[PDB]
Design a protein around this nucleic acid. Structure first.
Ligand SMILES: [Zn+2]
Lengths: 112, 172, 171, 234, 65, 98, 134
RNA sequence: AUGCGA
């Protein structure tokens, strides 16, 4: 009893993204993919935006270099997998409100 | 503080102790004890761990006494099953005594902490950094010398002589 | 009585002891030392200071799959909700850094040169788990969460405390 | 003794001579019968279900069997009723008040009890009791949003060890050591002469002795404390 | 999201203000704008228990044999 | 004759040391459940508790030398502190009854 | 944005045949996540012993492997959405990824099976008869 | 004080 491998896809197609438990994003949110061709290997960075927040994710290169993720779709009836190489991207979401700040100090001098 | 603890076996001398105020305060190293003065090849250890099945902490997304945490020099790198805790500890010792994995210095201390009811919080804390106290013992499965530190020793079955090696128990 | 002690030592072997305390109130406070005087800060501040994150990322960082600890669920809700009580105005990490720079600017001697963002971040870099080094701020975040989890596991009593005087725990 | 004359012995004890007629079994009954009994000592489990739209605390304390605590502490479920309904609840509810300050089946006779306890206690709302044994005591507590958050389990823990089924002031436990080279006696780990004064039918009171110098001085006077010092040091 | 007795902002992940401290239904996020109790509520309840430690006794030992 | 020694010493040379004790009880055990590296966790052997069957005339196994070192030290420690808590016992009332 | 000059624009994506053999709750298809040491070249495989359930040991050029299979992380009979292990599906090289679903239910799905390749090692047994010489 | 004789 072993599952057979039907097909392998070796070129960029599918990606994987880490988020907060509850991530749902707009029905339309779009994900900008980026690519790095480092020497002979690719490092990937994802960036997206929404009406309030903006979500940015990137790869842990030292774990990327030591482990590689593969996803496949199997059919039990066709016994077949479509393999896809996918980058896992650790995503964080900042909002526009997360873009406000104070002066570089609280305006103090000597006595204070 | 002055009480001689059994943890000191192989590290502090059970008889070299002054008598008076300092008694128990002025300990003495074993004649075979060594002190780490550097740190090495810690950078390559994550790569091998990743190969061994450690899930990267960004991907792991789990934490608890219910899971073994693999850490290197206080850099938390991942989580696995406690069973994988033991598999990693032993296979790690094999690759330690082996000579084909240069990213793995002989003097690394493999802190395995098994799961234990109200025991020490589990994990696989490796250490390669400075000031580790290290002492040689003979690793039997590869019949060659291995450097052990006091942390990992706690959970290690070291027979004191070859005739008392208990089956399935003493690894050194 | 419960608490965690990690002795972070920088590559150069200079040391910095960091302590976590569990308050009876569920609050956790962090002890450190600057100009060899001691200073206490709420840990949720140093968490939001290390990396931009969601509350769900910190919660998930601590309890994770452990969704069954009513004990931890409630203490940790006291922690996060309590921070929301104290500082409703620290809405983002940068502002938090401005709060730290503003409160330590008098003593970190960076003034007439550094902004509260620089003074704050330099503090994090010089105090919190310096063994992890500069730019380890996600890694320092993960480790600090590990100490919070170990601290609550000690609090419940599901694990024993260690012995500082055991040779086992020493260098 | 000598250095501090501490009025707080670490192990203050009172030796009790038991009459020649006092059977060994009577003595064991008295040993159990005098020892302090905290409510905690009989408690098996405490479940607090805080549901928040008053703040609901459904505290179900499922105890041991009636016979279990009846054979360890010689107490009944009715005595459990009185202690919970009068002491335990009042102290826990007061401790809850302290925590707020820190922030700032179902029969008619049972319904009459529950309503009466509500009438005696400001926070409590429901009362369901295992009247068939005492196996549990469940009561619903409702609070305003303004109550925020507390660790009610921890509150319970603290209140359980502060409620006593049976307490002789200062007296903890009566043990049955083997009699030897002298009269049969029972050594209690606490000092309260006045309470043994009621036990005169088992104790030739004239023969009570103790390691507590101060208590002797207060009760039996200066010469008795003197003789206790010379005996204890001896 | 609601978990146990915590309710996180579904859009942002913020542990938004308790439906109890709201006048509307939709607990709105302090980072996002989502509705809430406007949308119901995580009938917040926890089956909290004792650690089986607070109550030492011989009878506890009588549970051990 | 009682010139020096006790029958205890004679048995310690000629028979066995026996069970070492500390503060009134048997050998310390690590949090792992092991009393010595060489002992599996929870070894129920008397030796693993510190009972020394070897004697000075025929020697003691190393695990027993490691325990007898415990007893000898903690003895010398008590010996060095009891006298510091007994000076105050003398002087505190010697001032009074002088 | 398109930051860190060390990055490139995208030019090549691929349609996901989500429904060319889907039927609503009728096709028992699966999506898997598998962790592979960089040392192995997955594309040069031909079958996969994941069906071994637990004994998913595998031997690739005398290299020994174990495929750890987990039914949790995602197929848990316990929690609703235990995973942020988000699936992001494309369509065309000119369209951005999408949150996985099986209809338009805003439903993040889960991986039916998660596997992990771990390099096995001999760790040979002690020759007791040779070592414990008296 | 550090160390040490008893
Ligand atoms: Zn929000």
């Amino acid at each position: 009893s072993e599952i057979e491998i039907e097909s392998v896809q070796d070129q960029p197609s599918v990606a994987v993204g880490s988020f907060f438990k509850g991530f749902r994003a707009p029905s339309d949110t779009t994900f900008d993919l980026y690519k790095k061709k480092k020497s002979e290997k690719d490092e990937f960075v994802l960036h997206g935006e929404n009406e309030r927040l903006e979500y940015e994710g990137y790869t842990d290169s030292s774990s990327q270099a030591s482990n590689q993720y593969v996803v496949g779709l199997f059919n039990p009836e066709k016994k077949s997998i479509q393999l896809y190489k996918a980058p896992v991207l650790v995503s964080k979401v900042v909002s526009k409100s997360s873009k406000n700040l104070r002066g570089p100090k609280i305006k103090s001098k000597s006595d204070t | 503080v002055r009480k001689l603890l059994p943890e000191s076996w192989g590290f502090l001398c059970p008889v070299h102790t002054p008598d008076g105020s300092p008694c128990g305060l002025l300990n003495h190293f074993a004649h075979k004890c060594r002190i780490s003065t550097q740190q090495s090849d810690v950078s390559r250890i994550p790569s091998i761990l990743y190969s061994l099945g450690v899930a990267p902490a960004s991907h792991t997304f789990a934490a608890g006494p219910s899971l073994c945490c693999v850490q290197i020099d206080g850099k938390i790198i991942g989580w696995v099953s406690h069973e994988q805790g033991k598999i990693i500890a032993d296979t790690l010792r094999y690759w330690k005594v082996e000579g084909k994995t240069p990213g793995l210095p002989i003097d690394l201390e493999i802190g395995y902490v098994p799961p234990s009811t109200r025991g020490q919080y589990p994990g696989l804390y490796l250490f390669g950094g400075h000031s580790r106290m290290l002492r040689p013992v003979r690793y039997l499965p590869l019949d060659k010398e291995d450097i052990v530190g006091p942390f990992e020793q706690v959970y290690m079955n070291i027979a004191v002589t070859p005739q008392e090696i208990q089956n399935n128990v003493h690894t050194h | 009585h419960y608490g965690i002690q990690i002795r972070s030592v920088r590559p150069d072997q200079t040391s910095q002891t960091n302590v976590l305390h569990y308050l009876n109130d569920g609050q956790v406070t962090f002890r450190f030392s600057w100009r060899k005087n001691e200073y206490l800060v709420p840990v949720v501040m140093i968490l939001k200071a290390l990396c931009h994150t969601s509350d769900r990322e910190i919660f998930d960082g601590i309890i994770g799959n452990d969704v069954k600890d009513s004990f931890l669920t409630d203490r940790l809700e006291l922690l996060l909700r309590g921070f929301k009580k104290r500082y409703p105005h620290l809405q983002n990490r940068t502002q938090v850094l401005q709060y730290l720079g503003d409160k330590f600017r008098v003593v970190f001697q960076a003034s007439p040169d550094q902004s509260d963002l620089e003074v704050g971040q330099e503090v994090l870099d010089r105090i919190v788990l310096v063994h992890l080094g500069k730019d380890g701020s996600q890694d320092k975040f993960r480790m600090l969460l590990f100490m919070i989890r170990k601290l609550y596991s000690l609090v419940a009593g599901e694990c024993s405390p260690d012995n500082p005087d055991a040779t086992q725990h020493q260098e | 003794i000598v250095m501090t004359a501490s009025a707080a012995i670490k192990t203050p004890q009172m030796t009790l001579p038991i009459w020649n007629d006092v059977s060994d079994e009577q003595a064991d009954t008295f040993c159990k019968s005098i020892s302090k009994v905290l409510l905690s000592e009989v408690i098996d489990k405490v479940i607090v279900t805080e549901t928040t739209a008053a703040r609901s605390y459904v505290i179900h304390m499922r105890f041991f069997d009636n016979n279990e605590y009846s054979e360890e502490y010689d107490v009944s479920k009715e005595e459990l009723q009185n202690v919970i309904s009068n002491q335990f609840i009042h102290l826990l509810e007061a401790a809850i008040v302290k925590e707020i300050k820190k922030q700032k089946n179902m029969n008619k006779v049972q319904r009459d009890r529950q309503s009466a306890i509500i009438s005696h206690h400001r926070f409590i709302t429901k009362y369901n009791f295992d009247d068939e044994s005492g196996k549990w005591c469940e009561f619903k507590l409702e609070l305003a949003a303004d109550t925020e958050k507390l660790l009610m389990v921890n509150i319970v823990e603290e209140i359980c060890r502060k409620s006593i089924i049976r307490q002789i002031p200062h007296i903890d436990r009566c043990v049955h050591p083997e009699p030897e080279n002298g009269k049969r006696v029972l050594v209690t780990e606490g000092v309260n002469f006045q309470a043994m004064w009621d036990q005169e039918a088992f104790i030739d009171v004239d023969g009570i002795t103790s390691n507590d110098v101060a208590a002797v001085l207060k009760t039996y006077g200066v010469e008795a404390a003197r003789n206790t010092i010379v005996n204890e040091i001896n | 999201s609601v978990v146990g007795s915590l309710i996180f902002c579904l859009d942002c992940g913020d542990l938004l203000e308790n439906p109890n401290a709201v006048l509307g239904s939709n607990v709105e996020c302090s980072q996002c704008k989502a509705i809430y109790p406007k949308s119901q509520f995580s009938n917040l309840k926890v089956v909290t228990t004792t650690a089986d430690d607070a109550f030492p006794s011989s009878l506890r030992a009588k549970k051990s044999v | 004759s009682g010139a020096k020694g006790s029958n205890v010493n004679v048995s310690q040379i000629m028979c066995l040391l026996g069970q070492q004790a500390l503060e009134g009880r048997r050998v310390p055990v690590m949090v792992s459940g092991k009393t010595l590296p060489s002992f599996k966790p929870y070894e129920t052997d008397a030796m693993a508790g510190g009972y020394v069957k070897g004697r000075f005339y025929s020697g003691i196994k190393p695990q027993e030398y490691y325990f007898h070192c415990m007893a000898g030290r903690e003895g010398l420690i008590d010996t060095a502190v009891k006298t510091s808590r007994s000076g105050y016992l003398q002087r505190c009332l010697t001032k009074q009854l002088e | 944005f398109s930051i860190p000059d060390g990055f490139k624009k995208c030019k090549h994506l691929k349609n996901f045949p989500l429904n060319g053999d889907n039927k609503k709750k009728a096709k028992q298809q699966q999506v898997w996540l598998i962790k592979f040491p960089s040392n192995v070249d997955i594309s040069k495989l031909k079958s996969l012993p994941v069906d071994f359930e637990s004994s998913t040991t595998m031997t690739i050029d005398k290299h020994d492997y174990k495929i750890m299979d987990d039914t949790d992380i995602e197929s848990s009979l316990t929690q609703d959405n235990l995973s942020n292990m988000t699936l992001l599906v494309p369509s065309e090289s000119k369209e951005s990824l999408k949150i996985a679903s099986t209809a338009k239910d805003n439903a993040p799905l889960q991986f039916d099976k998660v596997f992990s390749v771990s390099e096995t090692a001999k760790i040979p047994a002690i020759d007791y008869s040779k070592v414990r010489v008296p």
